[PDB]
């Protein structure tokens with residue numbers, strides 16, 4: 001039916017050079033494969049533990065920004081060669097970066113269920129990504145489905161159906177299996193999931209119980225059985241969002 005959230009996938013010049021080897025083919029295939037692996041997790045998840053399954057993601061359009069964005073003095077762009085505010089770090093403040101991407105990609109984002117940015121930046125405090133949390137409410141801007149949000153400062157309409165993933169952490173490239181989980185997790189927020197309560201052991205098992213689920217606030221290793229699965233807490237939240245938003249912007253799988 002309408003069980004697929006089409007994506008606008010964007011790779012900046014950093015991801016192109018460091019993850020893609022300066023090759024459009026390589027960068028492109030990497031993203032295509034990663035999204036498909038993430039899609040397997042979503043598609044096989046039974047949100048109602050019964051029959052509400054088969055919902056996933058699929059790339060609608062891929063954009064590879066081979067080189068940085070020629071910028072002028074006092075202006076900033078998410079694909080600009082240098083980082084903001086501290087260029088020396090070559091890693092933006094993740095929050096400002098997600099907002100900038102949303103501002104600059106507004107036009108295209110209005111045409112897709114979700115827009116996701118892939119970069120290669122070593123964000124402070126082991127941060128690997130960020131994304132706006134979705135909601136079942138139609139007038140709630142964040143997450144799945146485009147809903148114009150007038151940005152007082154931006155002086156224009158933007159869409160908060162976005163998120164980003166970085167495959168660099170502590171000076172090195174993270175593992176492929178870790179990359180898959182960062183994106184699953186960020187898309188998870190987009191799909192309506194909040195962080196698993198570090199209290200309710202039902203949603204945050206001990207290592208001898210299979211480990212944490214993908215939406216735990218501290219990045220899982222991906223070594224354990226539960227690491228690439230959504231908890232009950234996440235299933236309930238995402239089910240709620242999907243139930244109403246799927247009718248809103250989900251399409252059929254191509």
Ligand SMILES: [Zn+2]
Pocket residue numbers: 185189195216217
């Ligand atoms: Zn999170």
